[PDB]
Amino acid sequence: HMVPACPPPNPHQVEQLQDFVSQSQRLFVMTGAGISTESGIPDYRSEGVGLYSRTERRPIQHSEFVQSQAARRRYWARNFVGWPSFSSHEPNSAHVNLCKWERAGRLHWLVTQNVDALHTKAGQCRLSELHGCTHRVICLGCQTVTKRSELQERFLNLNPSWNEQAHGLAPDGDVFLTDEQVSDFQVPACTKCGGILKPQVTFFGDTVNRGFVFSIYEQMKQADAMLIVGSSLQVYSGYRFALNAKELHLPIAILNIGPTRADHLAKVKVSARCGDVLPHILLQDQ
Ligand SMILES: Nc1ncnc2c1ncn2[C@@H]1O[C@H](COP(=O)(O)OP(=O)(O)OC[C@H]2O[C@H](O)[C@H](O)[C@@H]2O)[C@@H](O)[C@H]1O
Ligand SMILES: [Zn+2]
């Protein structure tokens, strides 16, 4: 299924990660798509199983969505089909345990690259969604934000004879459809202004808002350590925060099955399934 192959977890790494967490009172956590593979959502870059390893799916480019009605129709028809399954995924034990650490006052702040809403479903409050969330829709004309669930209803009224089955769900809820399968589909406009609606996610080629990025960096200034969970950090948007931790001289730990771009920066690396390991990390001696 969606989790990449990994050797049995090594208990000495687990013990090293524990010693790391025990020394932190204000943990800054970064997560990527690897935290959600145990929920049934594929990641992008896992050897063998990741969308880009195993398939020839290609990300939509920001520029193309913005400049082409036909691209927007393609994008939304696929998103439509994928939405009932994508929106139904549930948080796993890794999401839950990170929420426990927050409750315990040990997690200072968590940034995610994921768009799946799973940390929100788990109850994580001290959260930044770096790349947005597919559960939100924004208008490119007026910047009004609405719920993607409400858009589903609008798609059904506009496209009453639409059916296709959902095939190859991606980490952003996209499913494959052919250009002829999607050719007819009609996209609802903004109810306030009539402008073009976009999911409130940072597509390839877009950039994260600078004020938002700055505000996350501000949260980092109070942390005393960084943990990265389930990201290859091959995408600069995420890797810059590990670079920032190193500039702040924070110790860095990584819980990730494959290699990451920040491996060179880590004090501790646990190559294991995150859901196997996080439940064992304790916040109180026991
Ligand atoms: N259960 C697991 N436990 C631990 N590690 C895991 C697990 N499942 C997978 N991994 C590891 O999880 C890691 C997943 O890495 P990648 O697939 O690059 O996802 P990203 O979140 O970093 O992608 C960043 C952006 O790229 C996109 O364009 C979007 O914009 C994304 O937001 C691998 O190293 C796996 O070994
Ligand atoms: Zn509008």
Residue numbers in the entry: 30 to 315
The publication says:
The sirtuin core comprises a Rossmann-fold subdomain and a smaller Zn2+-binding module. The isoform differences in preferred substrate acyls are caused by binding of the acyl moiety to an active site channel with isoform-specific features.
Due to the occupied nucleotide binding site, the cofactor-binding loop between α2 and α3 is in the “closed” conformation, positioning the conserved Phe/Tyr (Tyr73) on top of the ADPr ribose. The loop is oriented deep into the catalytic core and contributes to the active site lining. The Sirt4 channel has a small positively charged patch at the outer entrance but is generally rather hydrophobic, and we speculate that it contributes to accommodation of longer substrate acyls.
